Design a protein around this ligand. Structure first.
Ligand code: NI
Ligand SMILES: [Zn+2]
Ligand SMILES: [Zn+2]
Length: 478
């Protein structure tokens, strides 16, 4: 079934590859921050851990490897570009799935990475026959278990414990100090608690971008390589347009195709249309880093098991803001509360400044928070921007609206953590301040607004980030 004479490998330049020291790996967020200047213009990058950094994998224990079940879905590789969703497949264990991957490869190819790539794109672009494969995607590490070790009390000291404490352990990455996801109490699947992906030959994750345009970190625990293609964030729009222009219209039946994640488009076609694409080959024991609003896709070269999680350093905030605004225009539901995270970061920073006031010990965390909140600080800019948005929206209404001190918009599903407009007629139903008028049609006397913080309190927060001790004192008490 393999036809190497008609291979269709695209000519894609390689994404950058990094080799961090041990010291570099002692501080994940700082290293990511430094990687930004070098690799954000690419969209993705490959990260090779220092020599001998390789955590044990609990999934390999036979109680899980042989007996733990996960569902799969069916992908028709020949239909990914030229033609809908991935149908239910059979249940698998890791052992069974590895076995079937072996069977499949031997039948199919009677093979190095580039051969596999050429054949994959041959199937996608110009299919001679139908090719179906199974994919175990978005598996929740809570039920099944994580690929990373966890600390277990009552055991002798081992390297496993050290790995379980590590910041590059994807179970710990999301809520590290410096990542605003730490201010979300719920263990959101995928976003804060890592997802597991079990792949076989040709298993595909189509073109997509992360929810809220977050950072994405992926670790390949075991198995065959995974081929990645990535688009720079600043070209996202371009990509989108090309998708509308090179598959016209697989955007008719479903204006919402981009977010369905069932469509593949060759990097060849993207390059002919002027969209820069970069390539990475992820092998077991390696990381793939994905930047805000950076489209990515790819496929597996055989049986493997990967883990993925989100992270949100302060420099993401801007993007994040944009994202939810976009969602509001798209009438799409959010996966998290942005204002909650922003406010959380602001209050944490304010607390650190307040601690500096009392001449308490200066810690690396306190330092990091301080360097992002002055007049020029990124956090301060984010908060100030948000507050300005609130002021403008508030000004547009409250003609008799009335206010009450303290949830999605009924119309655009905007998260209402900060403020929510409602009426007497319809309690338990809310609108964002943009669509406050669209809620009811009642007279102003019956309208009103739930508000978490008065406007002067918010401006006080902005001032506190800029270093006013009275404002700092005020917000430290919250
Ligand atoms: Ni992703
Ligand atoms: Zn709204
Ligand atoms: Zn009303």
């Amino acid at each position: 079934r393999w036809n190497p004479s008609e291979a269709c490998r695209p000519l894609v330049d390689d994404a950058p590859i990094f080799y961090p020291t041990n010291e570099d790996f002692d501080d994940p967020l700082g290293y990511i921050e430094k990687l930004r200047s070098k690799a954000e213009s690419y969209g993705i990058c490959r990260i090779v851990p220092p020599v001998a950094w390789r955590p044990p994998c609990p999934l390999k224990e036979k109680k899980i490897w042989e007996n733990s079940k996960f569902p799969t879905r069916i992908q028709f590789i020949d239909l990914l570009q030229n033609r809908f969703g991935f149908q239910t497949g059979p249940d698998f264990t890791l052992a069974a799935f590895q076995k079937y991957d072996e069977y499949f490869k031997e039948c199919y190819f009677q093979p190095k990475v580039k051969d596999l790539e050429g054949e994959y794109w041959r199937i996608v672009e110009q299919a001679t026959d139908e090719v179906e494969v199974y994919y175990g995607a978005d598996l929740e590490t809570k039920k099944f278990g994580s690929g990373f070790p966890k600390y277990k009390p009552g055991y002798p000291i081992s390297e496993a414990d050290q790995y379980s404490q590590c910041g590059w352990n994807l179970n710990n990455l999301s809520r590290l100090p410096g990542s605003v996801l730490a201010f979300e109490s719920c263990d959101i699947s995928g976003v804060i608690v890592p997802w597991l992906y079990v792949g076989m030959c040709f298993s595909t994750f189509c073109w997509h971008v992360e929810d809220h345009h977050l950072y994405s970190m992926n670790y390949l625990h075991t198995g065959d390589p995974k081929v990645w293609y990535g688009i720079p964030g600043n070209h996202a729009e371009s990509f989108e347009n090309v998708m509308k222009k090179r598959l016209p219209d697989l955007f008719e039946e479903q204006p919402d195709l981009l977010h369905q994640l069932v469509t593949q488009l060759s990097p060849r076609i993207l390059k002919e249309e002027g969209v820069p694409v970069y390539r990475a080959v992820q092998r077991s024991g390696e990381f793939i880093l994905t930047f805000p609003k950076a489209y990515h896709s790819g496929f597996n070269c055989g049986f493997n098991c990967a883990e993925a999680v989100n992270v949100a350093p302060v420099d993401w905030l801007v993007h994040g803001q944009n994202a939810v605004e976009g969602y509001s225009k798209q009438r799409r539901k959010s996966s998290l509360s942005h204002d909650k995270l922003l406010l959380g970061a602001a209050m944490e920073a304010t607390y650190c400044l307040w601690e500096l006031s009392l001449s308490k010990k200066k810690t690396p965390v306190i330092a990091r928070w301080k360097r992002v909140c002055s007049e020029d600080g990124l956090l301060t800019k984010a908060v100030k921007k948000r507050v300005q948005m609130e002021e403008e929206r508030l000004n547009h209404l409250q003609d008799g609206f009335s206010l009450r001190k303290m949830r999605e918009c009924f119309l655009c599903f905007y998260d209402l953590h900060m403020s929510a407009s409602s009426c007497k007629c319809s309690p338990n139903r809310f609108a964002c301040l943009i669509h406050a008028k669209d809620l009811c049609s009642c007279e102003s006397k019956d309208r009103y607004i739930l508000i978490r913080h008065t406007l002067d309190e918010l401006w006080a927060l902005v001032r506190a980030l800029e270093g006013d001790l009275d404002a700092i004192d005020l917000w430290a008490s919250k």
